Amino acid sequence: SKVTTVVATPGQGPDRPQEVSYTDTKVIGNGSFGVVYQAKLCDSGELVAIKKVLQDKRFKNRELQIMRKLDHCNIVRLRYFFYSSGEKKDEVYLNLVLDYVPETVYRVARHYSRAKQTLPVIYVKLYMYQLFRSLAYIHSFGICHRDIKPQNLLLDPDTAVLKLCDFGSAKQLVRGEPNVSYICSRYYRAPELIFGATDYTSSIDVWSAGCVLAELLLGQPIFPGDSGVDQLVEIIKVLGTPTREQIREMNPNFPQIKAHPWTKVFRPRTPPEAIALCSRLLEYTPTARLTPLEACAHSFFDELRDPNVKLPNGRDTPALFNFTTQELSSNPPLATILIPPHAR
Ligand SMILES: CC(C)Oc1cncc(-c2ccc3cnc(C(=O)NCC4CCOCC4)n3c2)c1
């Protein structure tokens, strides 16, 4: 019954520290960033995640400032943050107390591939829709995630709620200010980033999302490259060689191969609207890619807007159409498609 009590500021609302008590601490994740724990809150009994990262006193933490201003059903809420000691001697650690979610897209996708099965397309629709909705929301603040990958996409297996969680690579993209090119997980990295682009946009997340979509359809990563130029070689094998104009659009500042047909890339009987969506995300030209809100309105997701749609377990789908004023503001016309007649 070992209770840890800390003094923590709530993620939203006034800067008034309060006592937060928790127990049953266990490791659920780690990385170069640091460590993620699971814990149980003493009062409520609810499970939480505690992300612990190393922190400097003078410089302000970017992830924290990003996470505090996000409030969305497809993003893990920052419940509280607090400072502590850890593995090092004279070092302060930032702790982010977040919503807990019991599964990941990676784990579900791997569990299916271990059984030689493709994930049922209803789950592909549900998870990809919720990813794009979360991206639209964060992109409305000018925030780019910069690390969309199956490992970071959290899942409740019973409700099929998807949640974004890792904002350790995230950044407000200002037009004119340069950004690092070596970002995102390699297999999900936009080709402009491989070309060394420093003036890139939020469309890198859409490319990454497209790689996740393709992976869910294929049962394995679409572009499993080695480091350096070889990741671009993996992309070229499907997309064909990029033209001089496509390179200029990617990085304004060669091995010539024909594009493999999108139908031949995917399995027999992969839904044409899945393939169609994928071809409009995995585009060389970053401006040619769908926006996240355009992606949500794509016909691949029409089954989600059917009033008789259910999860495989027989439950109702999660909240997909409760779009706020803030969500709709980036492209208000799409509200017609996105909020279907029965949800109005
Ligand atoms: C590469 C991953 C570890 O990078 C990250 C980086 N930053 C934050 C996070 C993060 C945040 C909040 C949060 C809540 N649930 C989970 C979770 O992973 N649940 C999945 C389960 C998987 C099975 O074992 C129990 C945990 N969470 C992760 C992850």
Numbering used by the authors: 35 to 287, 293 to 383
Verbatim from the authors:
In humans, GSK-3 enzyme is encoded by two independent genes that regulate the expression of two diverse isoforms, namely GSK-3α and GSK-3β, with high sequence homology (~98%) in their kinase domain and substantial functional overlap. GSK-3β is a significantly networked enzyme, which regulates a plethora of physiological functions in peripheral tissues and the central nervous system (CNS), spanning from metabolism and cell cycle regulation to brain development. Accordingly, balanced GSK-3β regulation and signaling is key to human physiology but often compromised in diverse disease conditions such as diabetes, cancers, and brain disorders.
On these bases, starting from the INDZ core, compound physicochemical property evaluation and computer-aided methods were applied to support a scaffold hopping approach leading to the identification of novel imidazo[1,5-a]pyridine-1-carboxamide (IMID 1) and imidazo[1,5-a]pyridine-3-carboxamide (IMID 2) derivatives 7–18 as putative GSK-3β inhibitors with improved in vitro CNS permeability. In particular, we replaced the indazole N-Ha with a C-Ha group and shuffled the ring nitrogen atoms resulting in the IMID 1 and IMID 2 cores. These modifications were intended to reduce the acidity of the Ha atom so to enhance permeability, while retaining the tridentate H-bond interaction with the hinge residues and enzymatic potency. The tridentate interaction with the hinge residues, the oxanyl ring towards Arg141, R2 group contacting Lys85, and a pool of water molecules towards the open cavity and the back pocket were found. Compared to the docked structure, a very good consensus was observed with core RMSD = 0.35 Å, thus validating our models. The experimental binding mode also confirmed the stable water-bridged contact of the isopropoxyl group with Asp200 detected in the MD simulation. Next, compounds 10 and 16 showed none or weak interaction with Lys85, while the isopropoxyl group confirmed the anticipated interaction with Asp200 via a water molecule. Based on the observed arrangements, we may ascribe the H-bond between IMID C-Ha and Asp133 carbonyl group to a weakened interaction compared to INDZ N-Ha, so substantiating the affinity decrease of IMID 1 and IMID 2 derivatives versus the GSK-3β enzyme.
